Amino acid sequence: AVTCPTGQTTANEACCVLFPVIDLLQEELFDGGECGEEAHAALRLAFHDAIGFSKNGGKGGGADGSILAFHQTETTYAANSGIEDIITAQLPIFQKTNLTAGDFVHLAAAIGTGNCPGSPQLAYSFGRPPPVAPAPDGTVPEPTDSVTDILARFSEAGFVTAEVIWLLASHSIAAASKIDTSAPRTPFDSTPALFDTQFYLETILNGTLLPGDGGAHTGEVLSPIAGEMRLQSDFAFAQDPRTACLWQEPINDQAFIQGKFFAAMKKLQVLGQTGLTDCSDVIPVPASLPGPITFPAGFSEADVISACTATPLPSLATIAGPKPTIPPVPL
Ligand code: HEM
Ligand SMILES: [Ca+2]
Ligand SMILES: [Ca+2]
Ligand SMILES: [Zn+2]
Ligand SMILES: [Zn+2]
């Protein structure tokens, strides 16, 4: 019900100002629409930003962009290690806009995630007011935290157990650079450029290795594949009685995870916010997956630990060379 300077059509004139910002992001941040490090980092940033929130107060203003506006404070916390890199890349591009910090952070994550084939078209609201103060320390879960502690933290923000697992489909387009300091950008699945369910499957393969210097760095546990990092907390969720059957649910069920991730993200990116305008039609529709998921080369069902023997895991093909090595996400 309107048409904007740059041409495109929308439901509200307020949404018209988002189209130049989306070009600035794709050019100057996402290396021309890639599902690379900066796309992944933008998603991570949105979570770290939004989880500075508690329904009972005292833990920050939520999805307010506090992590951008007050980064000198928040990027000094341990649990935010590596965030400073994202902030440094986002801050100059932010300044070429008149958005609030919250509206920028969460649009960058909506756009970046969509550069990943297989991801759901994410909702995007805007009109967030400026963040007031930095979140306090300790709002961001750490991979050594217990399952109990992590689910408790999420509850405070307003999320149930299942939603925590669906939110972790993010790790399908994700890597670690602060655990293995000599091995930056080590992915958590085989296909960090694709938002598929590979992640869920490769985390239940038997852990036999350690990547990089082959040593036990603190937040990681044994990985099934060379070049792949497995977080201690991801493996905890994958094996824990409370969550192991939820963990297997998405495998090769792309539509299942698309809806669950779309809905949990819709809530996450508005935590602590009220009174926003819907602008989801500015958000590009991400490409689809070129085909269903397959076992990595040299793996089969033989290699899985089923903590959910209540459900037959779905059959799937298995590319055949030798067991591969996954390179780091590019820079
Ligand atoms: C549930 C508890 C979670 C824990 C313990 C956790 C932990 C971690 C850790 C340790 C890293 C690697 C940091 C580094 O060393 O570079 C990471 C990366 C990442 N996290 Fe999670 N995370 C959690 C939940 C989430 C959620 C809810 C989202 C978003 C929906 C998310 C999105 C990401 C992304 C995209 C990355 C990759 C960043 C990049 O490659 O640049 N995480 N996470
Ligand atoms: Ca925040
Ligand atoms: Ca993936
Ligand atoms: Zn900085
Ligand atoms: Zn390591």
Numbering used by the authors: 1 to 331
Which text from the study accompanies this structure?
Here, we characterize a similar enzyme (ApeLiP) from a fungus of the order Agaricales (with ~13,000 described species), the soil-inhabiting mushroom Agrocybe pediades. X-ray crystallography revealed that ApeLiP is structurally related to Polyporales LiPs, with a conserved heme-pocket and a solvent-exposed tryptophan. Its biochemical characterization shows that ApeLiP can oxidize both phenolic and non-phenolic lignin model-compounds, as well as different dyes. Moreover, using stopped-flow rapid spectrophotometry and 2D-NMR, we demonstrate that ApeLiP can also act on real lignin. Characterization of a variant lacking the above tryptophan residue shows that this is the oxidation site for lignin and other high redox-potential substrates, and also plays a role in phenolic substrate oxidation.
ApeLiP was successfully crystallized in the orthorhombic P212121 space group containing one molecule in the asymmetric unit. Its structure was determined by molecular replacement, and refined against the 1.85 Å diffraction data. It consists of 331 residues (from Thr1 of the mature protein to Leu331, only lacking the C-terminal Arg332) and contains one heme molecule, two Ca2+ ions and two Zn2+ ions. The overall folding is mainly helical, with 14 α-helices, and one short antiparallel β-sheet. Four disulfide bridges (Cys4-Cys16, Cys15-Cys279, Cys35-Cys116 and Cys245-Cys308) contribute to maintain the protein conformation together with the above Ca2+ ions, which are coordinated by Asp49, Gly63, Asp64 and Ser66 (Ca2+ at the heme distal side) and by Ser172, Asp196, Thr191, Leu194 and Asp189 (Ca2+ at the heme proximal side). Moreover, the presence of two structural zinc ions on the protein surface, from the crystallization medium, contributed to the folding stability. The heme pocket also includes conserved Phe188 and Asp234 on the proximal side, along with Phe47, His48 and Arg44 on the distal side, the two latter putatively involved in heme peroxidase activation by H2O2. The second channel is smaller and appears located directly on the heme propionates, occupying a position equivalent to that of the Mn2+-binding site in MnP and VP enzymes. However, the Glu37/Ala41/Ser177 residues identified at the ApeLiP channel are not compatible with cation coordination. The crystal structure also presents a solvent exposed tryptophan (Trp166), as the one reported for oxidation of bulky and high redox-potential aromatic substrates including the lignin molecule.
